[PDB]
Design an enzyme around this catalytic site. Sequence first.
Site, mmCIF file in Angstrom:
data_model
loop_
_atom_site.group_PDB
_atom_site.id
_atom_site.type_symbol
_atom_site.label_atom_id
_atom_site.label_comp_id
_atom_site.label_asym_id
_atom_site.label_seq_id
_atom_site.Cartn_x
_atom_site.Cartn_y
_atom_site.Cartn_z
ATOM 1 C CG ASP A 139 -1.690 0.766 1.074
ATOM 2 O OD1 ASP A 139 -2.699 0.725 0.610
ATOM 3 O OD2 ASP A 139 -1.622 1.930 1.805
ATOM 4 C CD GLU A 179 -2.316 1.896 -3.919
ATOM 5 O OE1 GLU A 179 -2.231 1.782 -2.407
ATOM 6 O OE2 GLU A 179 -3.356 2.984 -3.700
ATOM 7 C CE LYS A 222 -12.260 4.040 -0.548
ATOM 8 N NZ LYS A 222 -11.185 5.623 -0.306
ATOM 9 C CE1 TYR A 223 -13.540 5.695 4.466
ATOM 10 C CE2 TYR A 223 -14.392 5.369 2.609
ATOM 11 C CZ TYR A 223 -12.811 6.129 3.416
ATOM 12 O OH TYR A 223 -12.738 6.478 2.702
#
Lengths: 649, 649
Positions: free
Chosen positions: A380, A409, A520-521
């Site tokens: 990441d 990434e 994501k949340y």
Amino acid sequence: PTVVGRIPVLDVRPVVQRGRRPAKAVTGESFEVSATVFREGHDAVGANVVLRDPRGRPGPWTPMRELAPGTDRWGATVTAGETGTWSYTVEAWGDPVTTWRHHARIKIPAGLDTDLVLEEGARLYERAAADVPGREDRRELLAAVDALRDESRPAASRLAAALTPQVDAVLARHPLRDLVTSSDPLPLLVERERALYGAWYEFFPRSEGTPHTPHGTFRTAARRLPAIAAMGFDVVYLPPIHPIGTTHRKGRNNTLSATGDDVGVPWAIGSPEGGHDSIHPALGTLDDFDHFVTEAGKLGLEIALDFALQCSPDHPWVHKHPEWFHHRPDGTIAHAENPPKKYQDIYPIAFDADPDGLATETVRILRHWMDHGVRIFRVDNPHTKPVAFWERVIADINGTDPDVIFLAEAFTRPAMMATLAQIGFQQSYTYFTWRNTKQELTEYLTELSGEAASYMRPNFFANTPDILHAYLQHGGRPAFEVRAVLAATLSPTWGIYSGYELCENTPLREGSEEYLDSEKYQLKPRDWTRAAREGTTIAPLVTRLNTIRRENPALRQLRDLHFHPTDKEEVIAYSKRQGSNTVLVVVNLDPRHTQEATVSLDMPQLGLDWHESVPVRDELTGETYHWGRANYVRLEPGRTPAHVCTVLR
Amino acid sequence: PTVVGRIPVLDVRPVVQRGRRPAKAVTGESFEVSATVFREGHDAVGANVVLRDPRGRPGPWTPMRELAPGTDRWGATVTAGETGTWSYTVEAWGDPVTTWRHHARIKIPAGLDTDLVLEEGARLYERAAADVPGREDRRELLAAVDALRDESRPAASRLAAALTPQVDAVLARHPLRDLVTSSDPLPLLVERERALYGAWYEFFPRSEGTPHTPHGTFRTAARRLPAIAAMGFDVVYLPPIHPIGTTHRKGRNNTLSATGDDVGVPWAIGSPEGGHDSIHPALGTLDDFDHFVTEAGKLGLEIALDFALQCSPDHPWVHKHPEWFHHRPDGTIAHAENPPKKYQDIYPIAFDADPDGLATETVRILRHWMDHGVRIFRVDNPHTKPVAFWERVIADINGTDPDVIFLAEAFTRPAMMATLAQIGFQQSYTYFTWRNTKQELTEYLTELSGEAASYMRPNFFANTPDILHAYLQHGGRPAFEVRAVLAATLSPTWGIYSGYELCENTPLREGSEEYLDSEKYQLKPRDWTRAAREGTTIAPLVTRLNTIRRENPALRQLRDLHFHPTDKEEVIAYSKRQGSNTVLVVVNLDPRHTQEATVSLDMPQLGLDWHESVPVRDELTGETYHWGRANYVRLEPGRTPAHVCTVLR
């Protein structure tokens, strides 16, 4: 000692960092080695490439050819074998036979010094003969020598005897080389097929739960694996599977303060429950993970874990290793940022107080997941950590486990992007999602399939959790179809993030590349069964693309790619080759309007004559066409995003 | 150890052969050193260049700047001092002050964490202060620290005190550098002014004789030196001054068989009278040559001798060193060739049987002429001798005598031409004579003044004994005027071959670049006195050009050159700079028709505002103009070839 050798061989390519870092290939991949070769005076030169394996064993005779007239640039194609560290050298040499033949063809008809010219030829052919191991080949050359020397015969007859097809064949395989000069060897790192080729699928295991337990576990998530395998994918990329911080946790839609049941963002790694070597308790145990990885492997799926070297405020490292963070004068740690984006839930690592401790622990973490079957790490945002840090970590891991693949990434500027690949990242995320027009796609893929292919292997994700491009937002399903065809056919590694198949394209707001109600949340359950029965998934297209890839070697490589012209700016055409397999693709990049165009194939670039007309099969429909130099296409969005054709044998 | 350092500093330029051969400059010459510099995360980097002299002593603080936004490419100008081998490194570093200021200007007005930000600034400035050797500078920084920390004052006030001009000046000269990282040093060979800058004149001493002794001697030929010195030249290049072969000697107009009086071609070197270490008996003795060299030196003229490593059949080497030649099976040596041209009078050297003997003798010959004051060799057709041979010879000669300048007459393909410069040739002949259109001149000079200037110093001869271009043949005098202006203003080294001033332009035939009645094959007397009184010489223009060059430093450099657009394809405009000297040149490349055009100056590229109108003086006429953004010119061939203007200070 001089810097130039007897026969100049200069600027051998590919080269990475002036030879300080290796060029890349994978097993069975072909690429061009090139050099500037020439000599003094007017005589002919020849050149060849010598590829040496990890044991130092030389490859087959690989003669080079001048790549364009007057340029003194020579090249040959070579192919990587087994994995490991190889090297390559260019040999350059006087080619006196070609030189002699040139003069002989001119002097002998003009009757100039015919006996002298013919005797000169005989002595070259004698020297060439003395090197030939074959006995039949040796006798073939000596036979020509005798005829060259037969002074009772007409000059042009004696000469012809030295210019026969079988004499040519012997000499092409065993040339007489004068003044052989070698470049200094250059390094080649050969890695496994997957580093270059593979289909990737990203999903959040937590989203695949039940009505009773909405938060998915590894055991419930494993039920998704058969569907992913059935879509033709080879890698499953999981976002972070560790515990998640509670302090400054984000709520739904990236809201600042999470409420009671909000699950937070997996990238906010760490709590009292554990850090990067732990499993989120709601996902289950390390034993449940072993089960998931095992069940994946049985379906031909490799797991790629997210590695995000960063911490929630509740990560144990915050108190155990405070010197791994930069503290402001009041003691606080500034949360991570990629401006204008703020990550209040995440602390960035500081590398200059204890670089050795950070490196040691990083490689420990990686080896832990490696000992549980993870052989691929999606790293990441690597560009917010030191470049040399990644070099050291990667060299340390590949030192014992050279199969491990790292995917960078790095959505950043080209310098950092390049350098990351050059220091050892097997794969790179790319600008793909921001290349949507014909000019953008043509320029970018020309770049990626050119000199950059010696150090970078691209992973074309058509979407990510952080990227829903406007093209898709405004395009609908026909736009999802287009991007899938492009990704899958333009790069040997491509990917989608779960939801792409359902054409999820509602952004957070106009002008955003965030999804609305981002996974994501929050947990984001999907009615996969209903989508299938109602045909509201492009899952079949995806499946068809991965099948086509698995049946067509041309699609499992990067470097051989050519763009063919069309009379429509909306319509793009290109071709890829590998041995005798040729795939030809025509795409309507307009997701709203039918486009008709005339595709003008560069026939020689397919290896065909201009007048030739060879048949194709559109692998998306099974329908056959006869194409040649100029071809009408008509592509209706919704019905046909593109033609993905194979040239028939 | 990693290949990339803490702060990436990559691909430092100039670089030649990957660092295996030096980049070039001369004393007083400025050039750009560049590198790709960046770091992980979002904070600022800085960079600087460290130039080290032959003793290893560092140069002045040389801060770099990013050369284009988003590019991560940094550069600074550096300047070469005394001659010798230097090196250059780029230092890269975190620039925490620039970073802090950026955030502080945003956070402090927004009222975010103001005490914390201000204290953070104070601690950076304290560290910055601790490195500062100046006491006044140290106190200036500590003063800002105190202000930053004065919690009784308004936040934006405390901040402003750290952003003052004098604080900036202290920090610009002594920046706080984090994590300093250096590239590996690269080599710089600094040579004398004349390697880059000088005006060359070529003549055949034998052509300057008397009515009684038509074949000129060194003593008669010396009478031409004052006139050559008066035209502003610095170097006199003589064709071969050795004895000339009789066997297969060429006669007039390159006829095969010479008759009784024919003098032959100087390049057909060698007879029983002597070889390359001898004087042609008709030119006189080595004492007479010493006289010529002495008389030259007194006029500020250096001698450049032709070195042609080749032999007539009558050269002593032919029997003394037969293995220095390739013999055919009948024993004969094939005469030299540059097809379709044949040089029946000349045997080429073979280098593979006794490379060491050839090398030893070559350097002996050169040292002989060096002991007689020859410090410049014009090397004839070097590209027909081995590249490595020149590398060894040049390295041997400059090893003891680094002032010796070699000029490579390599009219060949670019790879060889480039490589010759890269292996040590101080100067190169060029494609100049075949660049006659605006596009040709612009493309070629862009190339020569760009990256090639790190390894090649061009010598722009407007003509040679072997090159009378069609431009001149069909152009007449106005074409001679044009090419003289171009040569003299586009390269810091230029030259002409005697006869150019008289506008001699009759070719051997249509489509030839040979002169009719070429001086290569015959004595060619000229009435220099009559030409001067009748005004049929462009000698005054030439003299004016060399004077302009000697009075304008901008014209004594290569790399600073910019082409300014015009609305006429026949009309070319360009500018050169050095310190505060700027020369602006406009040329009408049409030698038959008057051309009027609008010259549109890139004002910023001259260092001027767009609206500015700064005065010029045309140095050819002494006439003054006020030029700016857009300027009308009117150039009549015969009256005005060009405007050669200086921007008035």
